[PDB]
Design a protein around this ligand. Structure first.
Ligand SMILES: Cc1cc2nc3c(=O)[nH]c(=O)nc-3n(C[C@H](O)[C@H](O)[C@H](O)COP(=O)(O)O)c2cc1C
Length: 364
């Protein structure tokens, strides 16, 4: 676990270790207004021994939301709410990036003011569910709705929303932003061939399928600087409905495209819940060559596997998701080999402090 506890430079930041708390939706935002709050600030501060914390997905607009009670980052109140979180995290000496989110077709009208979801095309995500607020504090799971294909105007609007969300994140005190272009959400809906049936310049060819990602990133970098922009991709998982015919070519190309933008880090979501596809070392090495910045991987890693990935030159940082939910002092436990508490699925989403800030630190 030696390399895991080595510091690392991320743009203008000098992080304490290679451990990342990956973005994890907890749906604890205050109502009404979907505002980041006090318990969330405590929650993130409790886990500030991580080298880097990436916030749970935060929607860039009212129609970018896919799940009940997730925090937004477009209203003044929402910005202020996030400010309390970043202040709390910074007081602990940690860095934190805001994950800018647009779920595209992975949502239900109930979560976006009755509006129809948008996507690259009119394809509904197959076998996918999200959850909504149904007059009770227990997530109500529902099938996603059929989306409408984005028009040129929609594309301009979403890019504008992303750009402003980035500025909003800086106003909120975040050290940077992470573009959620993974796990089957909006941008991923353009990237993957089987989810994109557009006949215009945003579909039909690899270059075209990567165009939206290219333009969104261009706007983000222009707004806050490449050193403060990270991007998350999911080349092989397909849990939320996005499948690409030639992932290796598509995502190696995506990595090269992002390298041109000099984004500060590329984050690969290697596992999504129980979707843990074989991710060839050869593929990981190709990504390492296509993208020369900081490479982060998350998905079923333990101390041994994380150390191995870094020592083999495949990754620079490793994110631990589920373990960080239940172990606020995960880094210390990983370093000492202390047993890890396990999280309770029933309290991952919704509710209050229980299952959020009451997982204790290790005590022999
Ligand atoms: C409660 C929960 C919510 C999640 N929500 C998000 C999210 O908001 N954004 C994202 O990119 N990944 C999301 N993830 C995926 C994680 O960031 C991570 O990639 C995944 O859990 C695999 O890592 P693990 O096996 O160490 O948990 C979520 C996972 C958990 C456990």
């Amino acid at each position: 676990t030696q390399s895991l506890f080595q510091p690392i430079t991320l743009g203008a930041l000098t992080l304490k270790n290679r451990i990342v708390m990956p973005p994890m939706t907890r749906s604890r935002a205050s109502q009404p207004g979907d505002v980041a709050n006090h318990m969330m600030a405590i929650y993130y501060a409790q886990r500030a021994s991580a080298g880097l914390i990436v916030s749970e997905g935060t929607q860039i607009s009212p129609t970018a939301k896919g799940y009940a009670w997730t925090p937004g980052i477009y209203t003044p109140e929402q910005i202020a709410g996030w400010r309390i979180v970043t202040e709390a995290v910074h007081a602990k000496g940690c860095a934190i990036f805001a994950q800018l989110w647009h779920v595209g077709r992975v949502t239900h009208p109930d979560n976006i003011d009755g509006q129809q979801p948008i996507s690259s095309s009119t394809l509904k995500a197959e076998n996918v569910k999200v959850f909504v607020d149904n007059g009770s504090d227990e997530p109500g799971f529902v099938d996603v709705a059929v989306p409408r294909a984005m028009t040129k105007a929609d594309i301009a609007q979403v890019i504008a929303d992303y750009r402003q969300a980035a500025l909003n994140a800086m106003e909120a005190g975040f050290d940077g932003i992470e573009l959620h272009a993974a796990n089957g959400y909006l941008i991923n809906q353009f990237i993957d061939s089987e989810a994109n049936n557009r006949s215009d310049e945003y579909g039909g060819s690899l270059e075209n399928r990567l165009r939206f990602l290219d333009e969104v990133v261009a706007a983000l970098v222009d707004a806050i600087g490449a050193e403060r922009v990270g991007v998350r991709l999911a080349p092989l998982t397909t849990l939320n409905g996005t499948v690409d015919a030639d992932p290796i070519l598509t995502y190696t190309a995506a990595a090269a495209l992002l390298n041109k933008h000099r984004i500060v880090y590329l984050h690969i979501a290697e596992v999504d819940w129980d979707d843990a596809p074989d991710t060839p070392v050869s593929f990981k090495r190709a990504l390492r060559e296509a993208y020369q910045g900081v490479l982060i991987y998350a998905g079923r890693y333990n101390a041994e596997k994380a150390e191995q990935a870094i020592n083999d030159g495949l990754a620079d940082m490793i994110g631990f998701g589920r373990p960080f939910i239940a172990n606020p002092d995960l880094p210390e436990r990983l370093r000492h080999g202390y047993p890890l508490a396990e999280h309770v699925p029933a309290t991952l989403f919704g509710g209050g402090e229980k299952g959020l800030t009451d997982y204790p630190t290790y005590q022999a």
